[PDB]
């Protein structure tokens with residue numbers, strides 16, 4: 632026990648295994664139905680982890696993840712160990728899928744204000760995580776979800792940590808770490824260490840993705856050259872319809888001196904002000 636408050640009884644959960652809605656390196660994600668305490672049926676997303684010594688680490692992870700709670704951070708609904716043996720991670724269903732795919736979709740019409748609002752939401756989610764001394768390491772539009780109410784959830788963390796799109800990652804050959812090179816702070820490219828200050832660099836990249844509606848960053852600088860491009864002081868350019876003040880905020884996030892970058896509390900303030908004016 633001690634993980635009992637995280638536990639979901641098997642007969643209280645249906646996983647719709649024919650309906651794959653996501654795939655990461657650590658397992659598939661399926662549509663599911665959970666019967667809550669209320670006795671109401673709710674839509675969930677279920678994560679099937681394929682890959683006994685490491686079982687107790689999973690229960691360990693479930694409880695710490697359960698303690699995190701915020702409107703803009705992905706929440707853990709529960710975990711279900713079945714007779715199958717494959718641990719199941721139960722998370723709320725995100726109607727609009729990941730934020731990058733939502734904005735790239737040409738049939739969607741998010742407004743400039745919408746896009747700035749998504750950004751603010753992440754800033755808020757990230758503010759809460761940095762206060763709990765949590766470093767994300769992989770903040771990006773592809774790793775934020777969008778629910779039915781246009782609420783952004785910072786995901787890719789705890790039991791949901793994975794690679795869902797291999798395309799942008801280098802996997803280090805010695806340490807195993809995923810390295811999303813084009814979202815990485817300069818100092819992270821050099822030392823492979825990550826901080827809240829490097830999260831801030833990445834949030835900057837995320838804002839740029841928002842104001843370009845999911846364009847690939849630095850499409851013409853190869854991976855290797857990214858380090859000298861940044862050492863040369865060069866940075867991503869202002870997208871066409873990105874307000875001047877917001878771009879200034881991006882540039883702040885990319886200052887070569889980590890200490891010189893704003894904190895997420897400071898980013899929430901500047902961006903709320905931008906969001907509310909005009």
Ligand SMILES: O=[N+]([O-])c1cccc(CNc2nc(C(F)(F)F)nc3ncc(-c4cnn(C5CCNCC5)c4)cc23)c1
Pocket residue numbers: 652653654660676677678705722723724725726727728729773774775776785786787788791792793795
């Ligand atoms: O953990 N992540 O940050 C992450 C990032 C990218 C992909 C995933 C796996 N995809 C997912 N992970 C989760 C989570 F994290 F809560 F379990 N919840 C999810 N809810 C809904 C959907 C989904 C898939 N298609 N759609 C609709 C898109 C518009 N039309 C058709 C259906 C929604 C994908 C999820 C996870």
